[PDB]
Amino acid sequence: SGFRKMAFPSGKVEGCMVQVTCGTTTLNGLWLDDVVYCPRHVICTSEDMLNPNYEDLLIRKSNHNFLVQAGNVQLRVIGHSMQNCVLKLKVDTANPKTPKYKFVRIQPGQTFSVLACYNGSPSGVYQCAMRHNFTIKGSFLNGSCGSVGFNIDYDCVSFCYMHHMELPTGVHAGTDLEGNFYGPFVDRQTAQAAGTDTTITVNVLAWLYAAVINGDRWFLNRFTTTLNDFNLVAMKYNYEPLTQDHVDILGPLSAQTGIAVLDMCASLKELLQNGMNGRTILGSALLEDEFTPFDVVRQCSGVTFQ
Amino acid sequence: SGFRKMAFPSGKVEGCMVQVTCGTTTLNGLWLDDVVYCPRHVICTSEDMLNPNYEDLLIRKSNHNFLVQAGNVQLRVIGHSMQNCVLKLKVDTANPKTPKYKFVRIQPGQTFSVLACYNGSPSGVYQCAMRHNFTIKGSFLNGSCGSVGFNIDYDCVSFCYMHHMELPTGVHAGTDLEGNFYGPFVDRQTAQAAGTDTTITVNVLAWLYAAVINGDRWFLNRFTTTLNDFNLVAMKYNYEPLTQDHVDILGPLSAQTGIAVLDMCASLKELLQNGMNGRTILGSALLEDEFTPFDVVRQCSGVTFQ
Ligand SMILES: *C(=N)[C@H](C[C@@H]1CCNC1=O)NC(=O)[C@@H]1[C@@H]2[C@H](CN1C(=O)[C@@H](NC(=O)C(F)(F)F)C(C)(C)C)C2(C)C
Numbered sequence: 001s002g003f004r005k006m007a008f009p010s011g012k013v014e015g016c017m018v019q020v021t022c023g024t025t026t027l028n029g030l031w032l033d034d035v036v037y038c039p040r041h042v043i044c045t046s047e048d049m050l051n052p053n054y055e056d057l058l059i060r061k062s063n064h065n066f067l068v069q070a071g072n073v074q075l076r077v078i079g080h081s082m083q084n085c086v087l088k089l090k091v092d093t094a095n096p097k098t099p100k101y102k103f104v105r106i107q108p109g110q111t112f113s114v115l116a117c118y119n120g121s122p123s124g125v126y127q128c129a130m131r132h133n134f135t136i137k138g139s140f141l142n143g144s145c146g147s148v149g150f151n152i153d154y155d156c157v158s159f160c161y162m163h164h165m166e167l168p169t170g171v172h173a174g175t176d177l178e179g180n181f182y183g184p185f186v187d188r189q190t191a192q193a194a195g196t197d198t199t200i201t202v203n204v205l206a207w208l209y210a211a212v213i214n215g216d217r218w219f220l221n222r223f224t225t226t227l228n229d230f231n232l233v234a235m236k237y238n239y240e241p242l243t244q245d246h247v248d249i250l251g252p253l254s255a256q257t258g259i260a261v262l263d264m265c266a267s268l269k270e271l272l273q274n275g276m277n278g279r280t281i282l283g284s285a286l287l288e289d290e291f292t293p294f295d296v297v298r299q300c301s302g303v304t305f306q
Numbered sequence: 307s308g309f310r311k312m313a314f315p316s317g318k319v320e321g322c323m324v325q326v327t328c329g330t331t332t333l334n335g336l337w338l339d340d341v342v343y344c345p346r347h348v349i350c351t352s353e354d355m356l357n358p359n360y361e362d363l364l365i366r367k368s369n370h371n372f373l374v375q376a377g378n379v380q381l382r383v384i385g386h387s388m389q390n391c392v393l394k395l396k397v398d399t400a401n402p403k404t405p406k407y408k409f410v411r412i413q414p415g416q417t418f419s420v421l422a423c424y425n426g427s428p429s430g431v432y433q434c435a436m437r438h439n440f441t442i443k444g445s446f447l448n449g450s451c452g453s454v455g456f457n458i459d460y461d462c463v464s465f466c467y468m469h470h471m472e473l474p475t476g477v478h479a480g481t482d483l484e485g486n487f488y489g490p491f492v493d494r495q496t497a498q499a500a501g502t503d504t505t506i507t508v509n510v511l512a513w514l515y516a517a518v519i520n521g522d523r524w525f526l527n528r529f530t531t532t533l534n535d536f537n538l539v540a541m542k543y544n545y546e547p548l549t550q551d552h553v554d555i556l557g558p559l560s561a562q563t564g565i566a567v568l569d570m571c572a573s574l575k576e577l578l579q580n581g582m583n584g585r586t587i588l589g590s591a592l593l594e595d596e597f598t599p600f601d602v603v604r605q606c607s608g609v610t611f612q
């Protein structure tokens with residue numbers, strides 16, 4: 001038993017992390033096969049951060065201007081191109097530790113593990129979710145750019161995030177592995193701020209199911225509710241509307257615990273209107289929306305990865 | 307910026323995880339060099355779990371009775387011995403992925419990362435701390451025994467825990483890598499329960515320092531206090547007494563933020579007596595005691611590992 005914020009094993013991702021240096025700027029890069037992916041602001045000095053012209057700055061740089069280290073071995077760059085906000089440095093050596101990987105763009109509310117890296121070396125791993133304002137509540141410092149977010153399916157690593165910058169109130173923004181920013185954010189040091197963030201309702205219900213599996217069933221009531229009635233209360237408390245797709249996704253959790261999805265919605269409605277009254281659910285005094293239904297199933301069924 | 311429950315990268319530990327099967331029981335094993343470490347109840351059936359005689363059961367088993375798989379390759383066992391509660395199966399092949407490792411026994415209050423594994427394959431990684439009752443608030447299921455807890459120092463992996471069993475109220479107990487149980491627990495299916503657990507005071511203060519580094523400074527007051535006065539209030543709220551060693555350990559955090567340790571103790575004293583009044587610290591509505599001062603420094607300074 002027991003429920004924790006489990007992150008995916010980082011072994012496969014660790015073998016792909018390299019250090020990319022251009023001039024004086026240094027940050028992390030993702031080495032897959034013979035292509036290294038890194039944020040495009042490596043070619044920027046501190047003075048260029050305000051109003052950078054990335055296309056203009058990439059003109060003045062050649063292949064030898066990019067310094068890539070894979071541990072204690074320097075990788076020879078034989079080509080370079082820019083796709084959106086990420087650089088693709090082609091190297092003469094393919095990474096022998098490249099796993100089966102995919103480039104995916106996640107939707108808001110989905111979770112993934114972030115491998116925080118500095119100077120090409122991993123510092124730690126933690127799970128995170130893409131909030132509805134297209135930000136993440138991560139932990140990044142100077143030089144952490146290039147750290148990637150990933151999901152693992154058996155032996156397949158689904159890369160879905162690359163850290164690029166930090167927004168006010170301590171939130172972070174980034175791009176997919178194709179360089180496209182999540183949300184209306186640009187890679188320049190200007191006045192930017194994330195929009196209002198809503199609570200992922202489907203993740204809250206899944207987290208409540210994990211509580212029932214673990215024996216914490218004090219919040220369950222004897223009432224039921226319709227989808228429309230629950231959503232109207234959810235709108236007041238800045239909760240995302242619960243679609244039929246979310247209900248169908250929560251099906252396996254509903255079947256395992258013997259509690260209908262709408263019955264769990266009635267219990268959640270009482271919690272929103274009345275609070276927890278000083279009680280904790282799974283040791284947390286606040287409702288948790290960073291656990292997808294897949295995460296609950298994976299954590300409570302012991303799903304492993306090759 | 308940002309503060310999360312960061313776990314150590316699991317790449318080095320993943321290469322040491324193997325599956326150990328004896329008869330019908332299957333669990334995880336740690337493969338370091340030519341020795342495989344696993345819990346000793348692999349030689350037990352479901353009927354032996356009540357009152358097992360591990361020495362008696364190991365008599366009736368030979369080297370070929372132990373089935374060890376390293377992925378899709380079976381390892382030939384050429385020797386076996388029991389040290390306390392862990393088996394040492396000697397194999398003909400040394401693990402090529404064995405990193406620089408140490409066997410350490412941690413003290414209560416110290417944190418470490420747990421790599422939850424099933425059938426020799428990793429399921430996830432999460433940080434945890436040894437509570438003062440010698441238990442951990444982990445997440446384990448059937449077959450999770452043999453999962454190890456570890457700490458990483460540069461390139462050195464300090465193994466400090468091996469999961470063995472689950473106690474009531476969803477807490478878990480285990481041994482070091484030498485087979486010695488943490489606390490007064492035995493590896494048999496009998497009536498056992500953990501003692502009263504206290505809140506690790508030094509970890510709470512370190513977590514408060516991380517809040518100050520991240521800008522959350524609403525809880526800071528203008529008062530100071532002595533060590534004795536703070537401890538007396540701490541005893542009432544089931545908080546561990548703050549020794550001088552804890553104060554000296556919190557030194558780097560005190561110097562970085564410009565706040566004296568005793569000044570932070572006065573702020574903590576107010577929080578214990580008055581509560582948070584509906585406010586959150588680092589997004590948490592409850593005080594967190596699972597972050598050692600080293601964890602705060604490592605997280606806030608970006609300490610990496612080879
Ligand atoms: C990459 N190594 C850093 C890591 C940042 C810095 C501290 N926490 C992080 O995640 N990324 C940056 O320096 C990016 C980058 C320039 C500026 N930047 C920022 O994160 C800045 N914030 C913004 O630009 C904002 F808030 F408007 F989005 C900073 C002032 C440093 C927080 C570029 C090229 C956009």
Ligand SMILES: *C(=N)[C@H](C[C@@H]1CCNC1=O)NC(=O)[C@@H]1[C@@H]2[C@H](CN1C(=O)[C@@H](NC(=O)C(F)(F)F)C(C)(C)C)C2(C)C
Nearest residue numbers: 001347446447449450451471472473493494495496498
């Ligand atoms: C190893 N794979 C399992 C994993 C357990 C089971 C569910 N969560 C876990 O951590 N470990 C065990 O089955 C151990 C083991 C026998 C029984 N056991 C227990 O955890 C039992 N609890 C106790 O014995 C208690 F509470 F008294 F400490 C159980 C009833 C399964 C929770 C042996 C050989 C001690």
